[PDB]
């Protein structure tokens, strides 16, 4: 919905000046206020400037006077001018909008990509094994996960059939491999984890024509509570794969 | 007799949003200017009051609710909002009078590999009432079949870990949130600004 694009980052010598441009889309830019913040690696995020829809501006004390913030409604853009930069300003700067119109005070609702400024001196899921299988046959789908860093996570298999909304099929937890199957697939589909790598295998047995669908493999973070690990595979999932078509026909 | 705002903002630990902590603040002098005149808070929204004049106000009591959530949901901590946080974890009333203050805490509350000790409620049969707290952990019936207390395909554990990791995008980083509610009751004020 709301998209913010930031440009102007680069390398600047001490005492130089810089201009950063932030452009917004997907919402009424004129009515909403704007803000600029900075994050130093290893330190918490801090706000540097803010500007209201009515023209009121707020500047942080340690950067007051040196920093300037302006807005142009014609291009729906905000310009941030830096003068007399110092090594303490090396950080990633982010552009933010108001989350809600109501209320009084500066708000950072949405966060953009941000741009890094310095002073000189992902999880991917791949599904394989789809295709055409005769009725009553067997198949083996494989989901390969790359870039996974979470110690504990849940991997689920979902399917979307023609004329039907996407529905869950199976779920597995990484810590113990507990297996959850849907009512319509219990006793036929067998999901397992790979002992050596982070690959999940799904064996299809006693396939039926209604099983024809696009199958996806997805991954989310697990839950820890009361010294036990719980894994949930619901509609809302952290990541989603491309999926593969499986067709059960003569 | 300063109000113990340090104990709340600089707290040794922060609570999970599903189990958000409340501290009552009363019978003290509150200096909000130290709060507003800083760079520490990403968000400082107020409803029914002006931030510039908070030290001019007198209240019977202040309630301080505090918790951790993801950044992208901080906008939901406002009157008239919807979403998993407002609906199932912490709900502000339409006529809320008070301030919501939030700041990125990735440097304090994240760990490599994920902090699973912060939870939020992912499933609930109905929305929370304003200032309601639900700490139950009953299995959620997502389908037509009764769960009988057994976790399974359509039977979900109701809480979900955020799993904050330092490499997340800023929108997915943890933010600490404190909501100060200013109670206005027909009685003498006991928490006023500096004279
Ligand atoms: C906590 O202490 C730090 C010390 O640098 C201060 O900057 C911060 O504002 C304090 N937070 C509060 C309001 O307790």
Author numbering:
A (entry chain B): 1 to 82, 82A, 82B, 82C, 83 to 100, 100A, 100B, 100C, ...
B (entry chain A): 334 to 528
Question: What did the paper state?
Answer:
The SARS-CoV-2 spike protein binds the cellular receptor ACE2 and catalyzes membrane fusion. Structures show that the nanobodies target two distinct epitopes on the SARS-CoV-2 spike protein.
On the basis of a superimposition of complex structures VHH E and VHH V binding to the same RBD, we determined that the C terminus of VHH V and the N terminus of VHH E were close enough (33 Å) to allow fusion with a 15–amino acid–long (GGGGS)3 linker (VHH VE). Through localized reconstruction techniques, we were able to obtain a map of the VHH VE–RBD region of the full spike that enabled molecular modeling. All structural analyses of VHH U and VHH E in complex with RBD were based on one of the two copies in the asymmetric unit with closer alignment to the localized reconstructions of VHH E with RBD and VHH VE with RBD using cryo-EM. Simultaneous binding of VHH VE to the E and UVW interfaces may involve additional conformational changes not revealed on the unprocessed spike used for EM, possibly facilitating proteolytic processing of S2 to S2′, or bona fide dissociation of S1 from the SARS-CoV-2 spike.
